[PDB]
């Protein structure tokens, strides 16, 4: 009667599908099994046209929607957690709800691994010492014993330094911001003096 606890809460009626999906698959310990199975359906929704007609056509009746999905979903290695899921979305026309339920299941899976994104922008590419001096200030800016990925990036307008685009937080140690804030502390003291 107990479900495995969701690592972070979400919004409703389109993303808590993924919260419920994570609460089912982690009970079956099928976590990285079914997550890239959602990816294949997106490639099925990308390349093939007959399946992606079924996710947006408003004229197909409510029995051809389920009798193609359960016809396509034989065993084939596919999980019955996944097979009972994709039956349910074509049961109530929710086959358009796939591209949202994945990216929050992506978020919830990266919430199960303690594994946060970032994107660091410099003016200079990072060598094998410059990148390993970066993380020791970056891991002051995560809250706990988390992981860290790297998405190194080049832009000329920053004059050295970095900006850690956590997508939730940002730390500006770039000098182009520093010379801007140096100029604002010039003007706030030359006008007052």
């Amino acid at each position: 009667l107990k479900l495995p606890t969701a690592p972070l809460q979400l919004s409703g009626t389109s993303a808590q599908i993924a919260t419920l999906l994570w609460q089912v698959a982690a009970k079956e310990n099928q976590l990285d099994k079914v997550q890239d199975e959602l990816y294949q359906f997106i490639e099925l929704f990308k390349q093939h046209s007959e399946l992606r007609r079924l996710a947006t056509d408003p004229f197909v009746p409510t029995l051809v929607r389920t009798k193609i999905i359960s016809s396509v979903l034989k065993d084939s290695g596919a999980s019955e957690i996944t097979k009972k899921l994709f039956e349910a979305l074509a049961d109530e026309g929710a086959l358009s709800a796939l591209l949202e339920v994945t990216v929050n299941y992506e978020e919830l899976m990266l919430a199960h691994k303690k594994e946060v994104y970032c994107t660091v922008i410099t003016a200079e590419p990072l060598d094998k010492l410059e990148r390993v001096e970066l993380t020791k200030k970056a891991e002051k800016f995560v809250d706990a014993g988390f992981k860290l990925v790297m998405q190194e990036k080049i832009d000329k307008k920053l004059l050295g330094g970095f900006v850690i685009e956590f997508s939730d937080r940002r730390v500006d140690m770039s000098t182009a911001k520093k010379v801007e804030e140096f100029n604002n502390f010039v003007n706030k003291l030359v006008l007052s003096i």
Binding site: L20, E28, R52, A55, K83, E87, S96
Partner: peptide
């Protein structure tokens, strides 16, 4: 190209999560 119509959720039946939950727990062994 072929995923611009899939970019957002769209459905009827605002109580959809309660519908799918009874169709996700059966395959729980």
């Amino acid at each position: 190209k072929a995923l611009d119509e899939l970019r957002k959720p769209k459905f009827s039946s605002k109580y959809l999560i309660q519908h799918v939950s009874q169709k996700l727990i059966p395959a729980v062994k």
